[PDB]
Design a protein around this ligand. Structure first.
Ligand SMILES: Nc1ncnc2c1ncn2[C@@H]1O[C@H](CSCC[C@H](N)C(=O)O)[C@@H](O)[C@H]1O
Ligand SMILES: [Zn+2]
Ligand SMILES: [Zn+2]
Ligand SMILES: [Zn+2]
Lengths: 52, 104, 81, 431, 91
């Protein structure tokens, strides 16, 4: 509702996330291999339905 | 949401300066007639009773007392202004009476 | 008549001070103004009373008051002087 | 910046160049007492021959009428015509624009830099009596309007800015305003002007304090964004029995306008002393005598959290904690967890059982009355506690009151239960 | 400061005139000349004028000291002079 200077949305904060530790904890707790899925989610959140 | 915004209050001195202009423009008596008449009778009772007081004598006494009090307050305002204040105090009244010679 | 010095009320003495150009009034001044008004009235009333007593009268007239005031250097115009 | 909405705002109402009167008797100065000896300033007319402007009665001139909030009238004052103290009559408003705000709707902004004490804009509207005001207020409440449009010109005389008025109706409330409303006398009439409290730059919003009398209306939350905001729009309520404690705090205790009425009606009218409206001093007897019912609404839980963050009184906190003990709705408790109720309960403990303004037995009763719901609330992760670290406070108070063994054993059970919980995983961030 | 109190005590205990005779005499003659010329003067009239002017100036200085005392000061100023004169009624 109040984007910062020269930014359309807060999707740029996703690049600070450490997806590797999140994938490791997901694999430990739930036995899910989701390392590529976090990257796909990040790319889709940064730009919804790009032209691939 | 039917509330009312309030007009707030005046600053201290604005209504004071207004009423200053109003009382300095108009000339009516500021002391109530009947309490002043009772006070004059109370003072006169201390010397000799059964003393009737004509209306013109009471009016002359009221006019003289108002003139004296207005002059004393003008002098006391000058005293307060001299002491870098805007509020008059009893010490200015006593000093004004002292320099005027009324108080020894 | 018992202690009617309080009849000179606080708004009235405020008005009297206000005619003199005074902006602010201390809370302790009112008793002082009542005292000085009592003193002045005492002096003028005393002089008027002895003027009347010399005249063999029982009622103080305006002429005695104006005479007493003029004798104190406070000459009053408008009352038959 | 935000797009201009000046014409769009103007189309929403009938624009007025001057105040309209329901009748010729209303709005007259001195309660209708015509001062035939109108107050004429002794200023000499100062005509600048180059510009042909009469500079008399200016801002830095010594015009007595200007100081006393009275406007000069042409043909009656020695200052002459077109003096610099005819701001209302000449309608020399400051240049302003209307812009749409994020939450407050339309708002007024300064199109130019405006000096201190400068006249901004004359508040315009219809001058109406009290009965007409009541009728219009009832009609607008039936219409569901969520905006104030009434200002008190004086006692028994109001100004309505709903259907007809000026740009001043779009000014929004600020708890630290840059402008203020003042009352002035123009001729035999009374006007309400808006003056600059400070130096205002171009583009900045122009705001004034509403100081609004609710007349019994419900509070409206204030979204001004000022740091000194009280959180609600309001002002001194009805003359007596209207409030004993602040609303959020009163509604936190389950009290309402009726319960705040009833206590004062039962004692003040029967020769027992209740002080004036002041929330700096808590009356413990009212809080003890108040009735308590369980909470089942999340806004009431938010008001409870605000009361915990605000009130310092021992007795109000006791009765709020007792009401929480009666409360058993899990969703309200989850909301309190989201509001971090544990954080507030830590300070509530500390003020009473670490700072000692009370007696040890009563503090022990308080501690036993506050450990129970802490034992009872649903908990699933120490991330909740980590937002408060209330366990540290519990250790400090069991160590201080070690002689009172029931408190120690209850805190033992509580920390044993809490230590079984895991911690919610939080994704590490790059550094 | 000590010699100020010594001078106050000495002059308040003394009774002789403090204004010098010949400058005051010349001042009186110079002032009186512009009202009428070829004016003669008795010595006793000049002494009476000197005594009256000294008494008046002493009273004015006492009232001025009171005015200075009012303003939380110990040094007299010209504003005290015109305050005392204004209240006493001189113009
Ligand atoms: N700081 C603030 N926070 C929330 N609402 C506000 C506000 N200042 C003003 N308002 C709202 O605006 C009303 C005053 S009328 C102001 C113009 C109106 N909002 C409009 O755009 O048409 C108030 O009664 C309130 O409902
Ligand atoms: Zn003027
Ligand atoms: Zn003018
Ligand atoms: Zn606010």
């Amino acid at each position: 509702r109040s984007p910062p200077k020269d930014e359309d949305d807060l999707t740029f904060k996703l690049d600070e996330l450490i997806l590797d530790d999140y994938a490791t904890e997901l694999e430990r707790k739930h036995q899910l291999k989701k390392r590529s899925t976090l990257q796909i989610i990040k790319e889709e959140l940064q730009s919804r339905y790009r032209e691939i | 949401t039917g509330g009312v915004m309030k007009p707030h209050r005046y600053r201290p001195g604005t209504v004071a300066l207004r009423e200053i202009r109003r009382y300095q423009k108009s000339t009516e008596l500021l002391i109530r007639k009947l309490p002043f008449q009772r006070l004059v009778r109370e003072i006169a009772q201390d010397f000799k009773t059964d003393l009737r007081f004509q209306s013109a004598a009471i009016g002359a006494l009221q006019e003289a007392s108002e003139a004296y009090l207005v002059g004393l307050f003008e002098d006391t305002n000058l005293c307060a202004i001299h002491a870098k204040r805007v509020t008059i105090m009893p010490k200015d009244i006593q000093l004004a009476r002292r320099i005027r010679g009324e108080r020894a | 008549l018992r202690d009617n010095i309080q009849g000179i009320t606080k708004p009235a003495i405020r008005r009297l001070a206000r005619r003199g150009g005074v902006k602010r009034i201390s809370g302790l001044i009112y008793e002082e103004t009542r005292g000085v008004l009592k003193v002045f009235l005492e002096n003028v009333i005393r002089d008027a009373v002895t003027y009347t007593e010399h005249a063999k009268r029982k009622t103080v007239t305006a002429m005695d008051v104006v005479y007493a005031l003029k004798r104190q250097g406070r000459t009053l115009y408008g009352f038959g002087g | 910046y935000p797009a201009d909405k000046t014409e769009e705002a103007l189309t929403t109402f009938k624009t007025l160049s001057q105040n309209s009167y329901q009748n010729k008797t209303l709005g007259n100065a001195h309660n209708g007492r015509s001062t035939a000896d109108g107050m004429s300033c002794d200023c000499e007319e100062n005509w600048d021959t180059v510009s042909g402007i009469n500079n008399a009665c200016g801002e830095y001139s010594e015009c007595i009428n200007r100081l006393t909030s009275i406007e000069c009238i042409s043909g009656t004052c020695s200052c002459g015509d077109d003096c610099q103290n005819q701001r209302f009559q000449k309608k020399q408003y400051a240049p302003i624009a209307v812009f749409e705000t994020e939450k407050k709707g339309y708002g007024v902004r300064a199109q130019a830099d405006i000096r201190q004490d400068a006249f901004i804009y004359e508040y315009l509207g219809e001058v109406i009596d009290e009965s007409t005001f009541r009728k219009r207020k009832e009609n607008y409440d039936n219409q569901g309007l969520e905006h104030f449009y009434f200002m008190m010109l004086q006692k028994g005389e109001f100004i309505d800015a709903t259907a007809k008025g000026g740009l001043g109706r779009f000014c929004n409330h600020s708890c630290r305003p840059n402008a203020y409303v003042d009352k002035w006398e123009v001729g035999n009439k009374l006007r309400m002007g808006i003056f600059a409290k400070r130096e205002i730059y171009k583009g900045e919003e122009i705001c004034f304090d509403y100081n609004v009398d609710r007349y019994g209306a419900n509070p409206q939350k204030c979204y001004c964004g000022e740091d000194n905001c009280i959180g609600f729009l309001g002002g001194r309520t009805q003359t007596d029995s209207a409030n004993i404690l602040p609303v959020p705090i009163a509604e936190a205790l389950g009290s309402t306008n009726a319960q705040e009425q009833r206590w004062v009606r039962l004692m003040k009218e029967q020769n027992k002393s209740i002080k004036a409206s002041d929330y700096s001093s808590i009356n413990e007897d009212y809080v003890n005598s108040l009735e308590m019912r369980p909470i089942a609404d999340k806004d009431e839980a938010s008001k409870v959290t605000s009361a915990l963050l605000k009130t310092q009184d021992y007795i109000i906190l006791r009765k709020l904690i007792e009401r929480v003990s009666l409360t058993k709705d899990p969703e309200v408790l989850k909301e309190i967890v989201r509001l971090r109720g544990y954080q507030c309960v830590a300070n509530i403990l500390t003020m009473i059982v670490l700072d000692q303004e009370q007696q040890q037995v009563d503090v022990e009763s308080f501690t036993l009355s506050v450990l129970d719901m802490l034992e009872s609330w649903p908990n699933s992760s120490r991330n909740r506690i980590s937002s408060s670290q209330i366990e540290s406070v519990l250790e400090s108070v069991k160590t201080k009151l070690k002689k009172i063994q029931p408190i120690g054993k209850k805190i033992n059970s509580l920390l044993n239960s809490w230590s079984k919980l895991e911690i919610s995983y939080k994704i590490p961030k790059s550094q």
